[PDB]
Amino acid sequence: LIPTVIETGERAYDIYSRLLKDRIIMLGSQIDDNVANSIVSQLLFLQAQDSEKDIYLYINSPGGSVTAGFAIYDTIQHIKPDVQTICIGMAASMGSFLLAAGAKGKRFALPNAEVMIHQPLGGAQGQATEIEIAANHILKTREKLNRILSERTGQSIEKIQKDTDRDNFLTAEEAKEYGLIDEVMVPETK
Amino acid sequence: LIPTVIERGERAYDIYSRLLKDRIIMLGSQIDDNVANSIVSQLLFLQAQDSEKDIYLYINSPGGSVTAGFAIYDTIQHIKPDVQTICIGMAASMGSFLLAAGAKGKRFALPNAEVMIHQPLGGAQGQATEIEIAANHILKTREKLNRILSERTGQSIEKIQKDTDRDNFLTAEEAKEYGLIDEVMVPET
Amino acid sequence: NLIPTVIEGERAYDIYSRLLKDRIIMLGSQIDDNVANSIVSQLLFLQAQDSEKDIYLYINSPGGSVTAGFAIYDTIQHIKPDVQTICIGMAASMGSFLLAAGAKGKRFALPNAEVMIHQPLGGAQGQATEIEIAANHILKTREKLNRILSERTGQSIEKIQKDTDRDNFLTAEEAKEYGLIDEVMVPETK
Amino acid sequence: LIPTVIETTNRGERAYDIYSRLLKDRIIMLGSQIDDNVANSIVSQLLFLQAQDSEKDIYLYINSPGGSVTAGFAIYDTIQHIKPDVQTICIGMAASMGSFLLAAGAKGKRFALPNAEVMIHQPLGGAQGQATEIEIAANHILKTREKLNRILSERTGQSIEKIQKDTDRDNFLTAEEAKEYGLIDEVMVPET
Amino acid sequence: LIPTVIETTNRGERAYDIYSRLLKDRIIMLGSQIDDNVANSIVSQLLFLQAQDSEKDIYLYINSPGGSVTAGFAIYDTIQHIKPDVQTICIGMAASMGSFLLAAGAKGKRFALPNAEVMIHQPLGGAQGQATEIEIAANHILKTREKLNRILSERTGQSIEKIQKDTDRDNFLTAEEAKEYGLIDEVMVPETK
Amino acid sequence: LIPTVIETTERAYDIYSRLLKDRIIMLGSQIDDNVANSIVSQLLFLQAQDSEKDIYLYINSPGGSVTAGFAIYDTIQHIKPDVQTICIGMAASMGSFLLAAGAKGKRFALPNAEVMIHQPLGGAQGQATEIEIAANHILKTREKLNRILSERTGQSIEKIQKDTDRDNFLTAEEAKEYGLIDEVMVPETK
Amino acid sequence: LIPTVIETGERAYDIYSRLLKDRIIMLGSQIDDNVANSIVSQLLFLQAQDSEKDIYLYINSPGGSVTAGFAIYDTIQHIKPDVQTICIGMAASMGSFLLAAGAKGKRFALPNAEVMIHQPLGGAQGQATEIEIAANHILKTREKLNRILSERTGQSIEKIQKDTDRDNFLTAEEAKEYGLIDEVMVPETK
Amino acid sequence: LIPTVIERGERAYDIYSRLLKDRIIMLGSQIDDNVANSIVSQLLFLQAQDSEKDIYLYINSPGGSVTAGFAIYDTIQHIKPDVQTICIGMAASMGSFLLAAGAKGKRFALPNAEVMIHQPLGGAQGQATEIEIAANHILKTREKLNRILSERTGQSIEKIQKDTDRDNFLTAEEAKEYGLIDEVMVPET
Amino acid sequence: NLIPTVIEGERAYDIYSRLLKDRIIMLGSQIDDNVANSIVSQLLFLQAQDSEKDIYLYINSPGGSVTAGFAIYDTIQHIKPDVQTICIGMAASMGSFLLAAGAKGKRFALPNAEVMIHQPLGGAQGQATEIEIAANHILKTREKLNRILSERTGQSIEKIQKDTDRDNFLTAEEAKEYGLIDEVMVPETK
Ligand SMILES: CCOC[C@H]1CC2=C(CN1Cc1cccc(F)c1)C(=O)N(Cc1ccc(Cl)cc1)C1=NCCN12
Ligand SMILES: CCOC[C@H]1CC2=C(CN1Cc1cccc(F)c1)C(=O)N(Cc1ccc(Cl)cc1)C1=NCCN12
Ligand SMILES: CCOC[C@H]1CC2=C(CN1Cc1cccc(F)c1)C(=O)N(Cc1ccc(Cl)cc1)C1=NCCN12
Ligand SMILES: CCOC[C@H]1CC2=C(CN1Cc1cccc(F)c1)C(=O)N(Cc1ccc(Cl)cc1)C1=NCCN12
Ligand SMILES: CCOC[C@H]1CC2=C(CN1Cc1cccc(F)c1)C(=O)N(Cc1ccc(Cl)cc1)C1=NCCN12
Ligand SMILES: CCOC[C@H]1CC2=C(CN1Cc1cccc(F)c1)C(=O)N(Cc1ccc(Cl)cc1)C1=NCCN12
């Protein structure tokens, strides 16, 4: 149950609204349209409060809708502030795509976090012409995902295509070697 | 239930076994593997009884599996006897494909029978590459069906593709003009 | 149901197979492809036994599939023997259509039988153009039915269209006055 | 469930199920809810028995809660059409269209066992849709009741007015009461 | 849960739910399937914003698969009725009445993010019952498509014949393709990010 | 889902409570008893605040219960203020009945709005006399609705009966021509 | 419905028992244990009637259980008679594996028949040790299937592994080029 | 329902927000992503309030998702304050993994609390190669968990593997001897 | 349920929160982890308010999870304040165990309350060794419960084992005679 937080009671908020106060956005669920619209609004709200201060996007999500993921992706690239990303626990599907889309040099993963990449999933039923339409669409969607992943990791599109043909699980250090993140966040002091 | 008929001498058969004794095969249900396997067996059995007498295929079917329909189609083309076809009631999907596959000049429809043609149906769920494999296969299947329909009707492949893009209902008279059947069977005496 | 068995020589038959020996065919259920295919076969079998003796079609049926009914209809008109019809209990939908398809002068109903006429039922779900295709098809079907009903009853096509717009229940006497049957079969005893 | 009876005959061992054995003695069992399948089978048996002998009586055993009105009329009209007298007897219970067919037997040959029950009521139905569709259904079911009440009046001797009151609600009658009403001619007293 | 935003100002701390904060900047979120409830809320928001200021632009964010055609026309007719220009932007996806409403924004102020997708198609429906009932439903859904195609032709500049052919089946367009087609006026590009 | 509006000069309202402050009532759902009871209460509250200022009824509804619709209709006719009506999106069944019940000259429709008229729907299960009771009640209700519709539109009762036998869809312009509305509201400026 | 066949009635059998009389076995369903046990018994019965006469195995099946398929495979290889195979309509999964296991030179397909090859499918749920057990088992099963397929087609195991990684659909002529069958059965005369 | 507590001055909190005011975090349910995200946020919020005061993590949980458990585990190791842990009632699966992850010398269990350890669970359905990918991943995950448990308890990897092969129930006293906790909290005054 | 609200100064609280102000905790439902965690928190909160004043635990509960009950049990024995217990209505399973866990001399029941004791319930489905593990665990659990019950009632462990073999219903007076409570709380009025 979402706990209520008391600052210094004096002032009270739910935990996630208190995070937003520090310019932290929680992407901690499956990505559907509602989740994306919320995150888009939060990003635009933070830019309006300060168009130069970094924003922090916490990712612990199995992914979800590709179009919903691109709503968030395009909003990240449109705003002025750097958006840092960190994988907490797990990032798969569009979750890991967004992790890789954080400001260059500010993409992180905790030491035991897991990153998964794969090709998109879909579906089609009906006449042959309708199956062809869905196939052409999902294949075009895969090409768009692979091109951007190639641009943000430094790997070739051919390697991205090969490495996502099947479910591919990466450790935090492996995600750094791959170019999906920049640093494995080490503990501060203790 | 399936009635029993007596008769020549006093013999009792179920009505459909009696039909087979006159070299008539009833394709009167949705086409699945079990239906196709039975019809293939009946066709081969009739050819073994007499390799020169015509065979008669009665079609009142909404169609079904494409591969099951081709099992029947290939057996018709393989055996020596002519296989006559007649649409009674309705012939759709592979049912109308098999109606058009009868012996040239021996494909019929009763006056108020209906013929429907359309493109094949299918599905696909999974990774983008699995969707592509499923789409490529169903498109090849549609192309295979359309080529034969072009040969059997005399229409161009372009017209077959356009006319099967959506559900197309044809009257018996329209089916003859289209080339799916040769004659509308008219009431005798 | 528990269909009783009758014994006669040396022949035991279920009650319905015994009927066929007298050239009587029972149309006593909803009309589907299975029922139509069996009745078409029975009609052809009876003609092969004797191409001149009348056949008798008993009808106690709510109707059913239009194409299944036409399989029977066309087989009736194709074969040489006269096919008499009689409504027992109720004839609705394609059941009353087939009742009216008997050899003229040999269509009957029992005094308390009911006949119902009405327009065909159908459905359509999908794109606008798919709905239009299904509508044009079921309208063409209704015209085909009304055309034939007009020929076999003597009513104008416009009258048939009007009387079948809604469910229309007819007594045996009214079915005769309407032209659906030729005579109400009355008891020749008390 | 249904036992088989075997009898040494002229042409050798012959086997019947108990219900087919009853039919060989011109006994027809109406012992279930009346649907189209039950009515069509009973219509076929009545015509078969008349073809075997057009003057010998037929015996219709009734233990049924009733059912479809049109199915019941298929049996009713077949009874009135054939030449042989059709006797009726209620065993256990005859309700709805069951008691209608019980009263439809040959005059003087309508019976009920001493503890059998007879029930009469008005027809049941349903209707869902536009107002004009409900009107069509209401007119039809009301016509059906008038038809049923008229024949019941002819079969029992009671006026149409009394039939309307006595069938407005479920009305249970004893065997003696049924005889009294005219639905049956005599209550069958124990054979010796 | 819809998060709450705190605005530290020259007087202190103010709290709104995130969407009420969007409305304060004259931004309306069309981010779900379009049913009657969604349309009635958006119609109310458009009328409220015009009452607050009849000349400031309004911004309609669209990430929606579409839905009811009559619900979408409630929104369309309110956009055209009010005085302020209504800008539209496709975020993520605009399909069915979603892409129709995207094309209905003020001319020159219809946008899409670079990776957003636009889909156009013909309306969907159903019908079950008597033949004359099927005919009525078919006539109605076909008239609705003529209406949609007529307005879509006016908003895009394409002919009604081309729109009919291009919506016969599901048609997916990229942002640039939506601009070339005339459904949007500009692909909103990132300034250096 | 329902947004809250912040209005300068310290009040926060849900959007529908804000509409009521402008004497606007939203009939935007299927009409059941709860919907009617709330709308009746709103109408009485607005009259108590001001007995001469117009009230505005927004209609985007598929209709619903006839008695619930008449609860709204009778309250409209009872109160002193004029009740203007406008069809936005769609008005069918009791929805279109209430649209035509607005103050004469103040019944509107947006240009692309749809109006649907039809006869009432119902059901009946049981004894023959019970179905007769249900049928008599539905026909009475139809007459009532038709008679009022005739008075509100100027069309004869015979034409209303014919035009509502089946589902009848009308454009905004067709609704004006029929007399169900007075004006097609055209664009401010535009 | 399985029809009854009358020879010269005189003698009557169901259609499939009449086929068996000609040493024809129908593999026309999904392969489960019951189907395999039946076919094993039929093969042994035919060998007992004549240990030198060819046997004919008709295949129109989507496949099924791998162990059930190997029951049939091993019985084919154990008996003395040649077992001819023919793809009728479709053969996939173990169906196509059995098609390829027919006597060399007597493996056929009708011209429009389809052959599909793929890797085996399975499942596992539970502790990590149990998932490992199922994985090792299904991988071993794939190696056994690929080795035999390599022996009966002439292709290398590496090529079989590559070509079955995904669903692979072959035409009759393609199946012959691949080595899964020997001849495409052409029509005899007409 | 969650009770409301009053109190110092007159202040009202729900009982769990009152716990957080004393730097106590309740891990009292099955561990899914939503639970982990909330606990990660509470840990970071407490560190922002005071980076030197201990934090107290109450555990009464059957466990749940392994990745969600590691989200909590990594946040505990990342922040500066010591995070104390105590098992109340029961700690199983990732719940017992997190109990063992507390600050050295500050991992507790009430006397009648239960600790269970076992290997991770999962599933897999599809082609042989998909089953292999799923098995390889869950085996790597089990190896990752076992390595940390070895470091946190002092037991060898061999013993951890044997002791988690099947469901293993431990008493509080047994959990201390095993090295999963440091002390059994005994009743005071 | 509709929990009423009481008002008092200036404080409005639901009836259960008002109870806590008097150091009364309500254990009035089946015992699950959620209920246990809340009661543990309440106990610690009350001790933090005053480590010397008695706490009062009302019990009207069918029991539930054994581990959840022990969370409460151990918290009761850990804190300094005495915890009084009283059975209201019924205390069964872990509910009667916790009733017996109150401070000696301060365990009560209302005159017509019922107490039930019995052995724990559990399950086990799978391999022989898995069933043995679950059996040994639930037997160890029963010994732990019987050991403590023996200490707090004064009965031998063997007597407890015998009396809990089956469901055992006790009156308030019998619960006192058994040692589960210390006194039957009688009315100090009429
Ligand atoms: C309808 C066309 O217009 C689009 C434009 C309008 C607009 C934007 C950004 N849009 C582009 C866009 C949209 C979605 C994602 C994205 F990456 C860019 C914006 O960022 N703000 C400032 C703000 C936002 C949220 C709050 Cl809560 C407070 C302040 C703004 N204020 C008035 C209009 N407007
Ligand atoms: C590898 C198997 O290829 C076998 C070939 C063998 C064969 C055929 C035809 N098969 C080819 C085939 C198969 C399917 C469809 C098709 F178009 C051609 C055949 O027709 N008969 C005669 C017969 C059949 C059924 C009965 Cl009931 C009685 C007699 C026959 N008797 C022994 C072997 N054999
Ligand atoms: C596919 C070509 O079909 C032509 C023709 C073949 C045929 C017919 C009738 N077909 C036309 C037809 C079909 C359906 C309905 C209809 F109104 C007319 C027929 O009636 N008989 C006699 C018979 C039939 C059933 C039995 Cl049980 C016993 C004897 C017959 N014997 C060999 C071929 N043949
Ligand atoms: C289609 C219109 O005409 C039907 C008519 C013809 C006929 C009758 C009586 N039908 C009238 C009828 C039908 C239904 C109910 C009813 F009350 C009367 C009949 O009774 N038999 C003798 C018989 C019947 C069943 C067997 Cl099992 C054996 C012998 C007969 N044999 C050939 C034609 N025919
Ligand atoms: C019933 C017939 O008339 C309706 C008319 C009346 C009206 C309108 C506009 N309606 C037309 C309309 C309706 C729906 C959509 C559309 F495109 C135009 C309006 O915009 N306002 C101002 C306002 C609105 C919302 C808020 Cl929250 C605050 C202020 C207003 N105030 C009193 C009446 N009225
Ligand atoms: C239990 C161990 O023994 C096995 C052996 C016994 C046996 C066989 C073959 N088994 C080997 C086997 C079994 C399954 C498949 C397979 F490839 C080989 C056999 O083929 N026949 C002849 C026969 C068979 C079926 C009929 Cl219907 C009539 C005659 C036989 N007769 C007695 C024992 N026996």
Ligand SMILES: CCOC[C@H]1CC2=C(CN1Cc1cccc(F)c1)C(=O)N(Cc1ccc(Cl)cc1)C1=NCCN12
């Ligand atoms: C790419 C994002 O990496 C962000 C980094 C930023 C950050 C952290 C820690 N993140 C790393 C991280 C994330 C998840 C777990 C974990 F172990 C460490 C932080 O702890 N605080 C203080 C704070 C937090 C919650 C509240 Cl309620 C109030 C204050 C903070 N304030 C602004 C940015 N920021």
Ligand SMILES: CCOC[C@H]1CC2=C(CN1Cc1cccc(F)c1)C(=O)N(Cc1ccc(Cl)cc1)C1=NCCN12
């Ligand atoms: C993980 C280490 O746990 C040790 C200790 C921490 C602690 C306790 C009790 N723990 C032990 C414990 C836990 C569960 C049950 C139990 F019987 C004893 C405590 O009682 N209080 C005071 C308090 C609590 C709740 C509120 Cl609402 C207000 C005040 C406290 N304040 C800071 C740390 N701490």
